Amino acid sequence: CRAIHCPRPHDFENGEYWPRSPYYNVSDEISFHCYDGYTLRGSANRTCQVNGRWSGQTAICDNGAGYCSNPGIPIGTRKVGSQYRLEDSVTYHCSRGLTLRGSQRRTCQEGGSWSGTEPSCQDSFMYDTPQEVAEAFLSSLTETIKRKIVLDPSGSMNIYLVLDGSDSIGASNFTG
Amino acid sequence: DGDEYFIGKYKEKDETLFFASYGLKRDPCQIVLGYKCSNNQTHFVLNFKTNKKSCISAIKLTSYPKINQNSDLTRNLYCQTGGIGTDNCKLVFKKRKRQIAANIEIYGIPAKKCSFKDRYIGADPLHVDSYGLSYQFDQEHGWNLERNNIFKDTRFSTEVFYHKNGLFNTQITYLAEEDSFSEAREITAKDIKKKFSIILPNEEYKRISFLDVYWFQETMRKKPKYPYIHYNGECSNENKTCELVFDTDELMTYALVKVFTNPESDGSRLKEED
Numbered sequence: 001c002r003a004i005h006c007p008r009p010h011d012f013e014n015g016e017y018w019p020r021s022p023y024y025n026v027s028d029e030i031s032f033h034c035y036d037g038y039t040l041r042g043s044a045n046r047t048c049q050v051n052g053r054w055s056g057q058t059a060i061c062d063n064g065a066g067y068c069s070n071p072g073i074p075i076g077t078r079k080v081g082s083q084y085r086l087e088d089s090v091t092y093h094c095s096r097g098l099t100l101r102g103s104q105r106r107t108c109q110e111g112g113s114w115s116g117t118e119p120s121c122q123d124s125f126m127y128d129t130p131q132e133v134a135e136a137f138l139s140s141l142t143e144t145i146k147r148k149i150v151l152d153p154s155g156s157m158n159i160y161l162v163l164d165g166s167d168s169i170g171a172s173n174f175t176g
Numbered sequence: 177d178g179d180e181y182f183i184g185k186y187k188e189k190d191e192t193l194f195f196a197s198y199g200l201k202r203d204p205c206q207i208v209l210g211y212k213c214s215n216n217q218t219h220f221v222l223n224f225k226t227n228k229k230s231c232i233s234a235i236k237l238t239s240y241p242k243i244n245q246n247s248d249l250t251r252n253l254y255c256q257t258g259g260i261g262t263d264n265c266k267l268v269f270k271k272r273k274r275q276i277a278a279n280i281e282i283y284g285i286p287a288k289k290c291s292f293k294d295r296y297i298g299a300d301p302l303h304v305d306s307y308g309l310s311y312q313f314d315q316e317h318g319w320n321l322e323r324n325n326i327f328k329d330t331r332f333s334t335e336v337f338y339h340k341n342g343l344f345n346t347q348i349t350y351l352a353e354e355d356s357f358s359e360a361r362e363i364t365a366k367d368i369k370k371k372f373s374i375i376l377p378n379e380e381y382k383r384i385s386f387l388d389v390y391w392f393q394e395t396m397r398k399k400p401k402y403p404y405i406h407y408n409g410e411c412s413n414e415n416k417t418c419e420l421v422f423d424t425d426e427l428m429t430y431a432l433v434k435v436f437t438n439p440e441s442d443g444s445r446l447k448e449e450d
C-alpha cells in the first residue's frame with residue numbers, strides 16, 4: 001500500500017503553478033497564477049486532502065472574447081481545442097493511471113454553455129464522501145431558494161428505482 | 177419571433193447606446209466594451225454605464241425561444257439603479273428554464289434636449305392615453321371606467337396603480353367626457369429630489385378637474401414599493417394656484433403630468449361609495 005500522492009497538473013494553459021514537482025504529497029499547496037490580461041476563476045491556493053482532489057474549484061484563466069468561456073483544464077486532464085466559439089467542441093482525456101469521469105467531448109451550446117459535466121481524473125482508491133454526494137444529489141434534484149422539487153404545471157414525475165442482484169453482496173434482502 | 181420586453185418608448189430617429197447578444201446560460205458573461213454581469217438561475221443583471229453625454233431613452237430585450245406567456249401578468253425588466261433619462265442603469269431581468277439567449281439593445285438621446293414629451297403624447301391624447309389604449313366611458317354618470325387587461329396593484333381604498341412597459345401610472349381621480357385637454361408638464365432628472373411639489377393654474381378656463389401621473393422609478397426588489405402620492409388641501413375656486421406634493425420611498429427618475437380643465441367642475445370628484 002503506497003503513500004498517497006496527488007495528481008500532477010498535466011497542463012495549466014495561460015498561467016503558471018507554483019511549485020512544480022514530479023509528485024505532490026498530502027497537504028501540499030499550489031498557487032495558481034494567471035498571465036496578464038487573463039482573469040482567474042476558481043481556487044488559487046489549492047491543497048489536496050487525503051481524498052485525492054484539490055480543494056476548491058478548478059483554477060481557470062480566461063480572456064472572455066468568445067461565445068462561451070474556457071471550460072478549464074482540470075488537474076491531470078489535458079484539453080484539446082482552443083476554439084471556444086459556438087458549435088465548437090473540445091476534448092478531454094487523462095494521463096497514465098487516471099480514468100476520465102465527465103464528458104469525453106464537450107460541445108458549446110447555443111445557450112452559451114457546454115453540453116456535459118466537467119471532467120476529472122480519478123483513480124481506484126478515490127471515493128466520494130457521503131456529504132458531497134448528498135449535496136450534489138440535492139442540487140441536481142431540487143432548486144434552492146430552502147429547497148423544492150418543481151415540475152411542469154398540471155404535471156407529475158416518475159421514478160425508476162433499479163437494483164442489481166449481482167454475486168457480490170446480495171445478503172439478507174438488500175440490508176440497508 | 178421572440179419575447180420582446182420593453183422599457184420606455186422606441187424612437188426611429190435616434191441612435192443606440194450599444195447592442196450585444198448575451199448567452200443566458202453562460203457563467204459568467206463576456207464583458208463587452210467594459211460592462212459587468214451577474215448571472216444566476218433566476219436572475220440576469222447588467223451593470224451598464226456609458227461614457228457619453230447622453231441620457232438613456234429606451235431599453236428592449238429579446239428573449240429566445242418564444243414562450244407563450246403574457247408579459248402583462250408580472251414585470252420582467254427593470255433598471256434597479258437609475259433608469260430611463262439617466263446615463264446608466266443596473267438592468268435586471270428574470271430568466272426561465274426555456275430562455276437560453278438574449279439580445280439587448282439600449283438607446284440614448286443627447287443630454288441637451290433630454291425630454292420625452294415628443295413620444296409619450298401621440299397625435300390625439302384626448303381619446304388615447306400614453307399606453308396607447310382607447311378611453312372607455314360609462315353611461316351611469318357620464319364618466320370614465322376601469323381597465324383590467326394589464327398589471328395592477330392596490331394598497332389602500334380607491335388607489336390606482338398601473339404598470340406597463342416600465343411605466344408606472346396613476347389617475348387622480350376621474351375624468352369626464354366633456355372636459356377639454358389643455359397641456360402637459362415634464363420633470364427632468366436635475367429637478368428631482370426625494371420630495372417635491374408642483375404648482376398649476378386653477379383660474380378662469382384653467383380649473384383643474386383631473387390629473388394623471390406617469391413615471392419611471394427604481395426597485396430594490398421584484399415587488400416595488402409604490403410612492404405615497406396624496407393631494408394636500410382642497411383645489412377650490414378661491415385658491416388661484418393649486419399645489420400637489422409627492423412623498424417617495426424610492427427615488428424617481430422621470431415624471432410627466434397632463435392637465436385637464438373644466439370651468440363647470442365643482443373641484444371635487446368621488447363616487448357615491450363608502
Ligand SMILES: *[C@@H]1O[C@H](CO)[C@@H](O[C@@H]2O[C@H](CO)[C@@H](O[C@@H]3O[C@H](CO)[C@@H](O)[C@H](O)[C@@H]3O)[C@H](O)[C@H]2NC(C)=O)[C@H](O)[C@H]1NC(C)=O
Pocket residue numbers: 003021023025
Ligand atoms: C514528499 O514525500 C516523500 C515521501 O514521503 C518525501 O521523500 C522523502 O525522502 C525519501 C525519498 O523518497 C523517502 O523515502 C524513504 O527515505 C529513506 C531515508 O530516510 C530511504 O531509506 C528510502 O528511500 C525511503 O523510501 C522518505 O520517506 C521521505 N522523507 C520522509 C521524512 O518521509 C519527500 O521529501 C516529500 N516532499 C517532496 C517535495 O517530495
Ligand SMILES: *[C@@H]1O[C@H](CO)[C@@H](O[C@@H]2O[C@H](CO)[C@@H](O[C@@H]3O[C@H](CO)[C@@H](O)[C@H](O)[C@@H]3O)[C@H](O)[C@H]2NC(C)=O)[C@H](O)[C@H]1NC(C)=O
Pocket residue numbers: 144145214215216217218219220221256268397
Ligand atoms: C441569484 O443571483 C442574484 C444576482 O444575480 C441574486 O440577487 C441578489 O441577491 C442579493 C442577496 O440576496 C441582493 O443583495 C441585497 O443587497 C441589499 C443592498 O442594501 C441588502 O440590503 C440586502 O440585504 C441584500 O444583501 C441583491 O440585491 C440581489 N440582486 C438583485 C438584482 O435582485 C439572488 O439572490 C440569487 N439567488 C439565489 C442565490 O438563490
Ligand SMILES: *[C@@H]1O[C@H](CO[C@@H]2O[C@H](CO)[C@@H](O[C@@H]3O[C@H](CO)[C@@H](O)[C@H](O)[C@@H]3O)[C@H](O)[C@H]2NC(C)=O)[C@@H](O)[C@H](O)[C@H]1NC(C)=O
Pocket residue numbers: 408409410411412415417418419
Ligand atoms: C389654497 O390655500 C388654502 C389655505 O392655505 C392653507 O391654510 C392656511 C390659511 O387657511 C395657510 O396659512 C396658515 O394660516 C393659519 C391660520 O388659519 C396660521 O396659523 C398658519 O401659521 C398659516 O399661516 C396655510 O399656510 C396653508 N397651508 C396649510 C397646509 O394649511 C388651502 O386650504 C387650500 O387647500 C389651497 N388650495 C390648493 C392647495 O389647491
Ligand SMILES: *[C@@H]1O[C@H](CO)[C@@H](O)[C@H](O)[C@H]1NC(C)=O
Pocket residue numbers: 031044045
Ligand atoms: C495564498 O497563500 C499564500 C501563502 O500560503 C499567501 O501569501 C497568499 O496571499 C494567498 N493568496 C490568496 C489568499 O489569494
Ligand SMILES: *[C@@H]1O[C@H](CO)[C@@H](O)[C@H](O)[C@H]1NC(C)=O
Pocket residue numbers: 172173
Ligand atoms: C429474505 O426474504 C425472504 C423472502 O422475502 C425470506 O424467506 C428470508 O428469510 C429473508 N432473509 C432473511 C430474513 O435473512
